[PDB]
């Protein structure tokens, strides 16, 4: 009744997701390493183990809170495997002291205690310290020091205890598989059977994803980390030969960071050049020869890469100075584009399934929610960041990931704002009307690989036109930092005239086949079985009721479905659930899924002067006669053949207007020529994102994940209880908007100014009790505009403080939609 | 009203573009139009070479009428196809994707190869009907057990495939079905083609190239300038290189990325005058013209293209 | 209000353009303007040289104020007119032509 499983790899990883499938009843499980039980010798075997839990990741914060509550649990002849001797994370420079005001905005909002310190506070904790530099910092007392190796050992010998096989000295060589599931794993000895198998693998987790033809994006990497001689300062003052009792220290202005062993000092140095590493060329270690200093994860120590960081240590901690360099190693780990973990379910081979590319820190907490995926089908914890499937394919390149990966590490300590882009590689996918964005002007930021305008600089000339109501107050630096007044007058535009804005990135899914029907019906809330034509907006949710996407169904025909949908973690649910339902089905119950957004675009044409506008170059009629509200239907705009679809995420009027990539700058340049009298103009991300917030429209990944139900969300209106069956109906019998313990609220900000981006903490009557999900600037209500989860009993007029760089901001709950709630813009 | 055989419309224009057209309006593209596709017959751009190319090359004056959409840039460019390397517009050509666990089944019947082969050969076949007569000469590439890409002459192959295919899932069992698309508008495909197009993708792509790494007539999938392509090793022309296949989101990167690495090999854009020449030196068919329903593969030369040993 | 010092006018803008204008834009000129000319800052084209520069070369972050209308793109541009080759627009340099027996 139990699963076969085979783990590849005994880090810290490996052991941990034994250990949490044992817990959970599942112990059919064998754990391998090509490196010997007693030192496996990846990168887990090399780590120093500080572990900071603030994150600007909900999700990496609350792995980080697990993994120090195992670790401290986690014990033998009274030594446990964390020493919380607290984290502090300093400021050398006036950006960094900010930012940490930010950090502990995020460490309320997770739950997280921690301090801004004074440069006078900062030498009381950590007297070593050159005050000089030191302007403020950032102390967490229940951050720590790991005890990893020692960690693995324990997991070892209790998951053993309990029936788990481990055989270490053992090299996957290949995996094993039929009819599109794995069936074992290869060895020089023979193949294990496995139901399922698990790749814990560490650096080496592309390789092992090659043995099934799966893309792992992870670029193993090498980073400094060198031990001192005896630090005359410190001498007599910890247990010898490792302990520690002064808060990790983190210098990330100078790519640093620190901790006591003994008497002396380890220092990890980020200050160096990338350095990628071919693991094909570590050799293989004989199992008998690995040892501290001889292992795979180890490369040769390059003392000139690490003079500089030598010398910026010796500034921040004069004491160093009285000391010489000991040991110094170049140790290999794993970094990916997005800084993010690679978890989850191949696409390539059901039962095979990733956790890779995981710092210490996180190790049991990604351990935890793959133990609960394996044994129910759903992780607790939001895995939208982590899921292997969230990349589009031009991210999965060999070379894309060797470079944004390079460029990560080369980023890993810097101050960044959250729309910050890449510089390179860019311009890799673009919409049909990339020539004609360019013409006017577009500012590109991108996503998914695809460049998106964000506003258009031709619009800068309507801004002494607009009326002064439309214009807003100055921003600060940090967020004006990619935001430009111009989106004011595009917002204006779209409110009062008409706008084009490119709908092309939107994920796009054909869904065709007899069983097409059949399957959308069990994966989403609506009873679609309603004649070609109509538009559904509908949820699709796992088994617990928690929200997977928000997406558009259109029926065109039939046997065919276009959906509008999140990402490519909602592509590769819907590819293994049509799969599954062709394998198992009849003749009529086929299906095929097939993401046909690179071969396709749309514009959204929204606003008061829409139907004026397309009436010019289109004898379809547009009237309300003509195309209802949510309904599509086939027209010719132009000359092009175009699929139309009235809605809009701004809440005005118009349409989707989809066509095939080779007829869409036609489509574009009909449309433009035909709106010139009507003032039309091209739209941007940062006036469409202001305008969807005006209308309370919920943007999947923030306001809403799997760690929210849809009464929650306030997406009730589009859960059908009365259909028989659905994927979470069990889960919601009952439940309501009115009842939910959290529900999503909106708030607007008082002072009518004081912007907020996301993930600041947000707090009633002084107590932490929700955190910005989505936020803008409302043009057309005149403030700014953030949403949050908040308790029941906070009500719509009550007032909340959102914290922002370490400043409580007064807001107040209001009604949702802020614009237009009788939708007579969008009506009739 | 007289007209030459190559006389476009002046409108309706510009329906349907390749990912590429801004770069080909930069290079002085020369556009005539099929099918609704605006299409390069060469490109001012390389009016340029024509005062360094060798005397041999320049052809003698055209009449009137023959000169009429035709220009001498044409041989500019068929010269640096044949002694440098040329980047075509391949995205034109009708592409069909047939798939499902009946797709092998259907094309088996309907055309005059054994297809029956590992992924990743390319196949050059006949369409014939039940007398002998050539409706299309196709290429078929597996791309995979149960997916494949045809290249074809136009509408008439795409509705006689849509109908075949539907009458044979009608009639099939649970593993007869199969789907045909068009696929043509959503993606595109250069010609990299000449004597110096292994030395430019080399440049742009760790994929491996060399006669090993892509025999003659096989497709495998590789990266070129980050983008994820289909190479198919064939060329209309007669020269060195391969097909290459995105999506059209994708054609403009591969398209430049393809550009800068060519700048020290001399590459240029060429357009369909120069293509119809050499294809015309290689004695490579247009259905259409050189061969229709009216002829069999025997009469038209395409014999080697029949495998009689076929069950059926 | 609180503005930078190389903060731009939105509009009037595109008043004076050099010969080389149409080029620039393909090139991806961040434009700043002095005297109705537009005068490009840095070419968003040469980010993709940031990537082969030497270490030596990149510079350590900016504040979010000395930040203001600059780019790391510009240490890059300064690295190739050091190593390799640039042009520059000196086209809005006052030039004045004084002629005549008395210009002496
Ligand atoms: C290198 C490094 C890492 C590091 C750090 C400092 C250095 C220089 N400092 C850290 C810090 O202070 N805090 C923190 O949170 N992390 C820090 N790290 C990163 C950390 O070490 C790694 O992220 C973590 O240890 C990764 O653990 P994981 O369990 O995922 O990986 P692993 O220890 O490398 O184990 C993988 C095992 O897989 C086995 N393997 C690989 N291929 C095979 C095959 N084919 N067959 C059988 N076994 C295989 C390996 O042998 C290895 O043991
Ligand atoms: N592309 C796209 N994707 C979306 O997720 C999306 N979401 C919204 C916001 N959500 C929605 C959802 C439902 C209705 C709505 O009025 N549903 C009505 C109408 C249904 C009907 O008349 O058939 C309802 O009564 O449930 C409007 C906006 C707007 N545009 C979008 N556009
Ligand atoms: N896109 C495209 N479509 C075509 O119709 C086309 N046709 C030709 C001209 N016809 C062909 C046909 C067969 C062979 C050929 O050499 N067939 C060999 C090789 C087969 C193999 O090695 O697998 C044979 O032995 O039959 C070459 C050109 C060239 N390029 C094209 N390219
Ligand atoms: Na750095």
């Not at 006036?94 to 440069?119: F, N, V």
């Not at 814990?200 to 001689?229: E, N, R, S």
């Not at 999947?700 to 139900?709: A, F, K, R, S, Y």
């Amino acid at each position: 009744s139990t699963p076969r499983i085979v783990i590849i790899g005994a880090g810290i990883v490996g052991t941990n997701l034994a250990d949490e499938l044992v817990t959970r009843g599942w112990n059919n499980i064998t754990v391998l390493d090509q490196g010997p039980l007693n030192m496996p010798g990846g990168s887990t075997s090399h780590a120093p183990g500080l572990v900071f839990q603030t994150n600007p990741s909900k999700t990496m914060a609350s792995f980080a809170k697990y993994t120090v509550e195992k670790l401290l649990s986690l014990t033998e002849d009274g030594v446990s495997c964390f020493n919380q001797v607290g984290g502090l994370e300093v400021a050398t420079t006036e950006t960094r002291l900010a930012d940490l005001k930010r950090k502990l905005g995020y460490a309320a909002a997770w739950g997280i205690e921690g301090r801004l310190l004074s440069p006078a506070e900062c030498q009381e904790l950590y007297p070593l310290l050159d005050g000089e530099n030191i302007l403020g910092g950032l102390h967490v007392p229940s951050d720590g020091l790991a005890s990893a190796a020692r960690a693995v050992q324990l997991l070892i010998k209790r998951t053993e205890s309990a029936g788990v096989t481990y055989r270490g000295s053992t090299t996957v060589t290949g995996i094993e598989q039929s009819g599109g599931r794995v069936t074992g794993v290869q060895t020089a000895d023979g193949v294990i059977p496995a139901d399922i198998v698990v790749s814990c693998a560490g650096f080496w987790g592309a390789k092992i994803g090659a043995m099934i033809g799966m893309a792992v994006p992870l670029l193993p990497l090498a980073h400094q980390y060198v031990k001192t001689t005896p630090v005359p300062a410190q001498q007599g003052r910890n247990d010898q030969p490792n302990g520690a009792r002064l808060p990790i220290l983190r210098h990330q202005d100078q790519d640093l960071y620190y901790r006591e062993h003994g008497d002396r000092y380890g220092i990890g140095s980020y200050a160096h050049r990338p350095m990628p590493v071919d693991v094909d060329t570590l050799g293989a270690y004989a199992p008998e020869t690995v040892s501290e200093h001889h292992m795979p994860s180890r490369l040769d120590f390059t003392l000139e890469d690490f003079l500089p960081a030598w010398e910026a240590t010796k500034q921040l901690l004069p004491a160093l100075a009285d000391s010489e360099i000991e040991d110094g190693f170049n140790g290999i780990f794993s970094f990916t584009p997005d800084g993010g973990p690679l978890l989850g379910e191949s696409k390539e081979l059901d039962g095979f399934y990733v956790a890779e590319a995981v710092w210490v820190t996180h190790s049991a907490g990604v351990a935890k929610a793959m133990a609960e995926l394996l044994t129910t089908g759903r992780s607790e914890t939001d895995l939208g960041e982590c899921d292997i499937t969230r990349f589009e394919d031009v991210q999965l390149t060999p070379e894309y990931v060797s470079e944004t990966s390079q460029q990560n590490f080369v980023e890993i300590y810097d101050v960044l704002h959250p729309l910050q882009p890449r510089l390179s590689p860019r311009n890799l996918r673009v919409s049909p009307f990339h020539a004609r964005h360019k013409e006017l002007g577009a500012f590109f930021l991108e996503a998914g690989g695809w460049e998106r305008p964000y506003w258009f600089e031709a619009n800068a000339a309507l801004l002494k036109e607009m009326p002064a109501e439309w214009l807003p107050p100055a921003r600060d630096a940090w967020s004006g930092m990619f935001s430009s007044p111009i989106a004011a007058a595009e917002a204006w535009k779209t409110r009062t005239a008409v706008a084009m804005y490119d709908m092309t990135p939107l994920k796009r899914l054909e869904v065709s086949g007899p069983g097409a029907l059949k399957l959308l019906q069990e994966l989403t809330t609506a009873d679609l079985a309603k004649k070609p034509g109509a538009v559904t907006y509908t949820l699709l949710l796992d088994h617990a009721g928690g929200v997977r996407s928000d997406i558009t169904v259109a029926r065109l025909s039939e046997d065919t479905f276009q959906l509008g949908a999140n990402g490519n973690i909602d592509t590769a649910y819907f590819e293994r659930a049509a799969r599954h339902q062709t394998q198992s089905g009849s003749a009529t119950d086929w299906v095929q899924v097939r993401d046909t957004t690179g071969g396709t675009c749309c514009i959204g044409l929204w606003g008061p002067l829409a139907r004026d506008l397309v009436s010019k170059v289109s004898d379809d009629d547009f009237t309300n006669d003509g195309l209802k509200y949510f309904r599509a239907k086939n027209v010719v705009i132009g000359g092009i053949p175009v699929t139309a679809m009235r809605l809009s995420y701004v809440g005005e009027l118009g349409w989707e207007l989809y066509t095939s990539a080779d007829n869409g700058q036609r489509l574009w340049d009909a449309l433009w020529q035909a709106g010139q009298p009507f003032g039309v103009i091209a739209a941007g991300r940062a006036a469409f994102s202001s305008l969807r917030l005006e209308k309370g429209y919920r943007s999947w990944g923030t306001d809403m994940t799997t760690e929210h139900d849809p009464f929650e969300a306030g997406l009730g209106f589009a859960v059908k209880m009365a259909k028989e069956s659905f994927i979470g109906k069990g889960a919601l019998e009952g439940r309501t908007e009115e009842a939910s313990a959290r529900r999503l609220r909106c708030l607007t900000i008082d002072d009518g100014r004081s912007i907020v981006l996301g993930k600041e903490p947000v707090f009633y009557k002084e107590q932490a009790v929700g955190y910005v999900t989505s936020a803008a600037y409302g043009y057309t209500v005149a403030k700014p505009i953030a949403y949050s989860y908040l308790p029941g009993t906070v009500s719509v007029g009550d007032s909340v403080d959102i914290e922002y760089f370490g400043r409580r901001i007064t807001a107040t709950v209001t009604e949702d939609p802020l614009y237009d709630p009788k939708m007579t813009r969008l009506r009739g």
